[PDB]
């Protein structure tokens, strides 16, 4: 009784602190052993029981039946005691004569089961025989011949079947759909309670607007198709009835994510067995066939033409753990993509995304979750041999400070020469770029005004913007300071193309840079237009730009990204420690309005994320909800120019995977003499 009471008080407390739905919209949620909403049994031995059954045969051995068992059901649980000497209960902890008694609970509930158990584990034969007739349970076949612990199981299973006990308990305590909708739809339908679908869902009138929501999608027997699982909330569904098919990104005023079709058949699911049914009215679960191709992950089904979407499900977990999936054989990529689509269609939380270099990334909750995903993928979703690897961390490059010298390049016919300079960015102007407050589409005068007023930007160069980096929108700016010179206007297209090639196709690891400025100082251009071709300038532009970026003490930066981790009070030290070992720090920690929950946000480098959730669970005892989103980039501390620095290891492995010359070239190939 002691352990039972602590367990049930603890569940009461932990439903009080979170489930603010106390008296009011649902009244008393409280879990309480008195009124039979708490059941006792051990599933290994097929038995379960509540106080109610013992109340019943106690009444029997002593309309109005319900109350006459309910009075002593209230009496039995609690601190109230019972005496055997007088065969009467007692609110006192001891007899009037002064002798203590065990409580009514133990004396009338756990004395009998223990008497049953000890006698059969110590093999007490005639005691068992007199108990069975004292327990007046039928003696069926096969139990009078065997013995031992299996006899224990069989006989007390026959005494208290779990089937009837839990069937009756759940029928009397859990609520049927009429009661469920009156307080469930406010978090189910985005539509106002005045719309026609709203009244249907509140009432569950199975003769009007068919409401549906497909959440689980279980695979079929064949291999590639599935059944769409969901519980009907309104209306009555039948075979082949034309119905709107809308998913999450659907908007009522648009046809996107909208489909108009019937269903193929209506199938009930039971265990491993299936059964078609003619029709299903409101309130209950069912599986459907033929809804496979026209839904993604999850969606809803509505007969009504104005019904909006249902509320998309929220997960405490996020697709945080990621692993790359590429086939063993290069000619399985379409097979693989059909596999990934099937996998993403099956489990309603995974995300399959193509990252910038093209890898196929499967993002999920935990390592075991992902493990099951790729197991099913390599078995049935694609049935194709697979190769596994962590996601590759992509890196952007930058310069620490200004290039020391004015870099010079010569055309391969030596008819032209280039003078230019390089700078880093004083602040996160690249962040304003990605935000969009500075962009190519922005006009020259107004963008110039913004730059001059906000970042002390040169007014002379205010009208001298040339390029905005990769694709003309990237976080790299090229301008010109060359004064009064003439054929440079015919070099601009070539220099812009060269700078584009340089930024997209980089220098140290052949990657994109971020937050770097380039200004061309002086140019000596051959008079005629034929000797300074694009194949004669653009290579020189890239040479000179690589020269500059090497001369300026080059640097590397890592995608340090935000981890929003949900955690209770007791193991904030755990997240502190794990972020510390993984080069991470919290910048935002706060308490939530409930009580036990801490919402905590910390910076963490992406390359440190592999296995991060695993050790997080290890140090938290499985008490962490590590949401992960990208935050920003930041300078990687070490200087790649030294070999013994961690950037040097990054650049080496990145060059290795990109299959290039491991050695960084010296300034000889980029910088040339006059």
């Amino acid at each position: 009784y002691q352990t039972f009471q602590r367990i049930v008080e603890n569940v009461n407390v932990i439903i009080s602190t979170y489930g603010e739905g106390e008296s009011g919209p649902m009244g008393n949620i409280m879990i309480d052993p008195v009124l039979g909403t708490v059941g006792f049994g051990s599933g290994l031995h097929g038995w379960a029981f509540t106080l109610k059954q013992f109340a019943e045969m106690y009444v029997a051995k002593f309309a109005e039946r319900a109350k006459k068992v309910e009075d002593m059901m209230k009496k039995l649980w609690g601190d109230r005691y019972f005496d055997p000497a007088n065969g009467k209960f007692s609110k006192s902890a001891t007899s009037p004569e002064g002798k203590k008694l065990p409580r009514t609970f133990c004396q009338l509930i756990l004395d009998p089961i223990f008497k049953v158990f000890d006698a059969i584990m110590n093999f007490k034969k005639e005691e068992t025989a007199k108990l069975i007739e004292k327990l007046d349970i039928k003696l069926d076949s096969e139990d009078k011949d065997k013995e031992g612990k299996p006899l224990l199981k069989a006989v007390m299973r026959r005494w208290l079947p779990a089937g009837d006990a839990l069937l009756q308990m759940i029928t009397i305590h859990l609520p049927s759909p009429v009661t469920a909708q009156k307080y469930r739809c406010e978090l189910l339908y985005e539509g106002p309670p005045d719309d026609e679908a709203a009244m249907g869902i509140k009432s569950c009138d199975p003769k009007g607007p068919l409401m549906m929501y497909i959440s689980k999608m279980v695979p079929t027997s064949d291999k590639g198709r599935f059944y769409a699982f969901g519980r009907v909330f309104s209306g009555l569904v039948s075979t082949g009835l034309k119905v709107r098919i809308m998913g999450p990104n659907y908007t009522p005023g648009k046809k996107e994510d909208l489909y108009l079709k019937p269903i193929q058949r209506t199938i009930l699911m039971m265990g491993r067995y299936v059964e078609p049914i003619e029709d299903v009215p409101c309130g209950n679960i069912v599986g459907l066939v033929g809804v496979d191709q026209f839904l993604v992950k999850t969606g809803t089904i509505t007969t009504f033409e104005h019904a909006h979407n249902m509320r998309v499900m929220k997960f405490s977990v996020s697709p945080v753990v990621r692993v790359a999936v590429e086939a063993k054989n290069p000619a399985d990529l379409p097979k693989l993509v059909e596999g990934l689509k099937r996998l993403a269609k099956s489990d309603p939380m995974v995300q399959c995304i193509i990252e910038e270099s093209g890898e196929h990334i499967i993002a999920g909750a935990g390592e075991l979750h992902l493990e099951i995903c790729l197991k099913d993928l390599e078995e049935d979703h694609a049935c194709i041999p697979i190769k596994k690897s962590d996601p590759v961390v992509s890196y952007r490059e930058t310069v620490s400070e200004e290039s020391n010298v004015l870099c010079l390049s010569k055309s391969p016919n030596k008819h032209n020469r280039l003078y230019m300079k390089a700078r880093p960015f004083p602040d996160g102007l690249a962040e304003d770029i990605d935000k969009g407050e500075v962009s190519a589409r922005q006009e020259l005068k107004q963008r110039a005004r913004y730059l001059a007023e906000k970042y002390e930007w040169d007014v002379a160069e205010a009208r001298k913007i040339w390029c905005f980096g990769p694709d003309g929108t990237g976080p790299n700016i090229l301008t010109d300071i060359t004064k009064g010179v003439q054929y440079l206007n015919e070099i601009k297209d070539s220099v812009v193309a060269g700078f584009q090639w340089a930024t997209k196709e980089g220098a140290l690891c052949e990657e994109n840079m971020r937050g770097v400025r380039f200004d061309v100082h002086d140019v000596t251009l051959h008079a005629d237009a034929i000797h300074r071709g694009g194949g004669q300038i653009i290579p020189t532009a890239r040479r000179c730009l690589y020269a500059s970026v090497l001369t300026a003490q080059p640097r590397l930066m890592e995608p340090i990204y935000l981890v929003e981790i949900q955690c209770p009070e007791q193991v904030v030290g755990g997240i502190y420690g794990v972020l510390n070992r993984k080069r991470g720090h919290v910048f935002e920690e706060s308490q939530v309005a409930g009580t036990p929950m801490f919402v905590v946000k910390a910076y963490l480098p992406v390359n440190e994320s592999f296995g991060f959730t695993a050790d997080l669970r290890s140090n938290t005892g499985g008490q962490a909800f590590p949401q992960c989103v990208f935050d920003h980039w930041q300078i990687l501390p070490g200087d790649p120019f030294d070999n013994s620095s961690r950037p040097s290891q990054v650049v080496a492995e990145t060059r290795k995977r990109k299959g290039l010359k491991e050695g960084i070239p010296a300034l000889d190939n980029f910088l040339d003499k006059l």
């Binding site: 910048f587 935002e588 920690e589 706060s590 308490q591």
Partner: protein, 141 residues
Amino acid sequence: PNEIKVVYLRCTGGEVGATSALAPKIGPLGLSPKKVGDDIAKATGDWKGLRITVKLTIQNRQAQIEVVPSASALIIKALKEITFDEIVNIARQMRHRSLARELSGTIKEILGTAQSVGCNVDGRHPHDIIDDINSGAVECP
């Protein structure tokens, strides 16, 4: 409790910072200030001093009084931009002066020695004056 008690201290200064500031991390001690509270705190706290600038915050329901301790460590860096003799004498006078005193000369040694890393009067280390504390050892009283 004087209608509010958020008297705990803060250790940011110089630039406003704001976003770089720890206001999100020290929100729930008073729960009132938030970013507007941080900004109004630093508007009066931008200057005086120019350092970590430890401050003691006394709430005003919505606003706060960020009284700065006259920390010798803070003020010396606030004064250097060098002899600063009468200035450091005056700075010693403006603090609570207690510093486990026996005499004014005790705090004089303490605050003319506190900047053993910030140098001292012109071309001498902040120790010779401490040994020969005679020039105005009674100048404060």
